[PDB]
UniProtKB/Swiss-Prot annotation, chains A, B:
It is a multi-pass membrane protein. The gene is RHO. Pfam families: 7tm_1 (PF00001), Rhodopsin_N (PF10413). Homodimer. May form a complex composed of RHO, GRK1 and RCVRN in a Ca(2+)-dependent manner; RCVRN prevents the interaction between GRK1 and RHO. Interacts with GRK1. Interacts (phosphorylated form) with SAG. Interacts with GNAT1. Interacts with GNAT3. SAG and G-proteins compete for a common binding site. Interacts with PRCD; the interaction promotes PRCD stability. Forms a complex with ASAP1 and ARF4. Forms a complex with ASAP1, RAB11A, Rabin8/RAB3IP, ARF4 and RAB11FIP3; the complex regulates Golgi-to-cilia rhodopsin/RHO transport in photoreceptors. The lineage of its organism: Eukaryota, Metazoa, Chordata, Craniata, Vertebrata. GO terms for molecular function: 11-cis retinal binding; arrestin family protein binding; G protein-coupled photoreceptor activity; G-protein alpha-subunit binding; guanyl-nucleotide exchange factor activity; identical protein binding; opsin binding; zinc ion binding. Changing E113Q: Causes shift to the activated conformation. Zn(2+) binds at E201, Q279. This is Rhodopsin. A motif ('Ionic lock' involved in activated form stabilization) lies at residues 134-136.
Length: 326, 326
């Protein structure tokens, strides 16, 4: 028996020595050295310092450039706000609590911080999904005589909110639950503990399917079709060298988008799966931190991929940074 | 009497309570809370995470692009290596010692770490100086029938090394000295203490003049003349719109370069001056950290200004990041 448990938590450490305390009450420095708690904080510092400017800039530059506000960009803006929730509801809090060596906000603080930290990265997730669907619709033109417009773009955004609530809201009401995780400075969904009172098991499956498999499939299909439609067109168009460039560009970019999605969600998926099927086994606090390290950083690399590498967004950004010129 | 002193150090705190320990021996958590030591470490993390890629990339991209290696770029490469010394000899060490709450490497560790941390930012300093001189020489053509070439560029680089040793080497031999500074996790020149055995006073003046005033003057003169020569040419050339752009660009860039130089060196200068003329007065550990916060970060913003905003370097960089294309 690998850890110690209580009404609202599970500490990944054995109380055989009597040292273990509530992660809501005293420091966890038996889980990890304090410098490791600092490093956790250092990381949380990095992600704020990078995540905030680049995501906030996105909103800001949109306000400055009329060229940018187009129904197809609505979802990208959604991404940037979602990333901000991640930045404030998650990274900063965790910067704060890590520096105490435990989650100082108690169980309600855990529900809140967990809800927003989940709501943030889930909106971001479904945004990447919705974007792919639209680009598929717009570029592949699967349904004839359909022009994508502002009203569709709204639903696409609202869809992310519904889907993200369909994930983050249930633990607040008793399907799974939020508990401190890893080094116990941050709160997340309990996918690793078979807590029957909240039916944690049925939820992790529902998560694995609806919030992982569905996204992975949609994202592959949609972009799959795209790299098809575009490679097709170029082969029928070879007298055009620009067109040849375009097909090249798009492919590369989709490879990046697809790889990026995996780097973000694979570890959380691989780990959740492994634990589910390895149930008798002991999983340390740091290791539990790893798939989180991966997903959290997406709040930096997503807008670099999806915004900064965008021709339109970058120029407006470069213009604004340089105070109106260039 | 504001602090406590010992053979190799000065702690900015009063031993009237008997709590003060050697910064080479035990934690300084009476100087500042531990979370503040973490934050110091977080900052040191930021500067490595940003400072290393962008400075190392510079060296690397030069290796990949023949277009870049030109005598006028030698000094820029010097800048990037100097910034690296700052990154490894300073930021990482300080990341390490901060996490102990004192300088764990003892006085010899203090001499080393101080020497390299000084040598780094001083090479960087004189690089910005040398660059300005060359650009003045090349653009203003003050001396007729002179073409700048590889051999001049070498001396320019070597000059930075001589000048930086003319600064960093004396404290190792008894003109001033290296002691832990601020929160006592890092070592620097002792400009704040009137330690007569090493003649700290005559050195801070020599520093203030030779390593601050001289740089400030040269940098203003040289770039002053440049924004003159270029504004002159455009006024005589107005039928050319490109030329009009150029004069605009250069001016803006010099404003940035000049402002940047001040942001880096003004606080260290203002503080050193104030302390010199305010000698009876007490200066806290954190405040002593401030002008260092400013100068250290230049290891990030200098190569952004001087390298990434360079048309030539950026493109090669953008090419290399994207794995040969675009
Ligand atoms: C991990 O292990 C440690 C050790 O098992 C455990 O800490 C212990 O918790 C109990 C509470 O359940 C503490 O017991 C108290 O001890 C003090 C005496 O110093 C008293 O204040 C308390 O007495 C009251 O309660 C007793 C019965 O529960 C009655 O006998 C008495 O009349 C009072 O009503 C009580 O004995 C105990 O001190 C700690 N021990 C240590 C070493 O901290 C901890 O709870 C575990 N962690 C987790 C995560 O569950
Ligand atoms: C800031 O203040 C504190 C308090 O003033 C100061 O720490 C003290 O340093 C002295 C050493 O100079 C320590 O004295 C030792 O105490 C222990 C007893 O616990 C003994 O090991 C030592 O005895 C030897 O030395 C004595 C004379 O120096 C002889 O009488 C004896 O025979 C032995 O030779 C010695 O007394 C003292 O314990 C600490 N006190 C505290 C509270 O830590 C500290 O040095 C100051 N910091 C700085 C930066 O200078
Ligand atoms: C940058 C934001 C910094 C926020 C405050 C960090 C405060 C850490 O606070 C410290 O936590 C310790 C337990 O670990 C307590 O014992 C100390 O009394 C408490 O001061
Ligand atoms: C990322 C690099 C982390 C390097 C190691 C940091 C080690 C901090 O180490 C700790 O310092 C304490 C005093 O402050 C000592 O009391 C502890 O015993 C020691 O483990
Ligand atoms: C060849 O095609 C290599 C191409 C792709 C490079 C894509 C880089 C995206 C980087 C996003 C930001 C990542 C780091 C975030 C750190 C917190
Ligand atoms: C109008 O001209 C505003 C123009 C200048 C912006 C120049 C920005 C340079 C930034 C360099 C890197 C700074 C941050 C380093 C953080 C560690």
């Amino acid at each position: 028996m690998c850890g110690t448990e209580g009404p609202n938590f599970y500490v990944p450490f054995s109380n055989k020595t009597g040292v273990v305390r509530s992660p809501f009450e005293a420091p966890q420095y038996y889980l990890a050295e304090p410098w490791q708690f600092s490093m956790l904080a250092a990381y949380m510092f990095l992600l704020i310092m990078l995540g905030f400017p680049i995501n906030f800039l996105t909103l800001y530059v949109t306000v400055q450039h009329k060229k940018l506000r187009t129904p197809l960009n609505y979802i990208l803006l959604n991404l940037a706000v979602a990333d901000l929730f991640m930045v404030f509801g998650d990274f900063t809090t965790t910067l704060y609590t890590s520096l105490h060596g435990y989650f100082v906000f108690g169980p309600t603080g855990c529900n809140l911080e967990g809800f927003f930290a989940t709501l943030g990265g889930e909106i971001a997730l479904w945004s990447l999904v919705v974007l792919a669907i639209e680009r598929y619709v717009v570029v592949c033109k699967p349904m004839s005589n359909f022009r994508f417009g502002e009203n569709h773009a709204i639903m696409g955004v609202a869809f992310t909110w519904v889907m993200a609530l369909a994930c983050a809201a249930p633990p607040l009401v008793g399907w799974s639950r939020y508990i401190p995780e890893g080094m116990q400075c941050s709160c997340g969904i309990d996918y690793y503990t078979p807590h029957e009172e909240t039916n944690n098991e049925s939820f992790v499956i529902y998560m694995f399917v609806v919030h992982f498999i569905i996204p992975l499939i949609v994202i592959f299909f949609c972009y799959g079709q795209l790299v098809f439609t575009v490679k097709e067109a170029a082969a029928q168009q070879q007298e055009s060298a620009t067109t040849q460039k375009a097909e090249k560009e798009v492919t590369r970019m989709v490879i990046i988008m697809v790889i990026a999605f995996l780097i973000c969600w694979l570890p959380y998926a691989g780990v959740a799966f492994y634990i589910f099927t390895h149930q008798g086994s002991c999983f340390g606090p740091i290791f539990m931190t790893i798939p989180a390290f991966f997903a959290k950083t997406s709040a930096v690399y997503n807008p670099v991929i999806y915004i900064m590498m965008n021709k339109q967004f970058r120029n407006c950004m470069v213009t604004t940074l340089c105070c109106g010129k260039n």
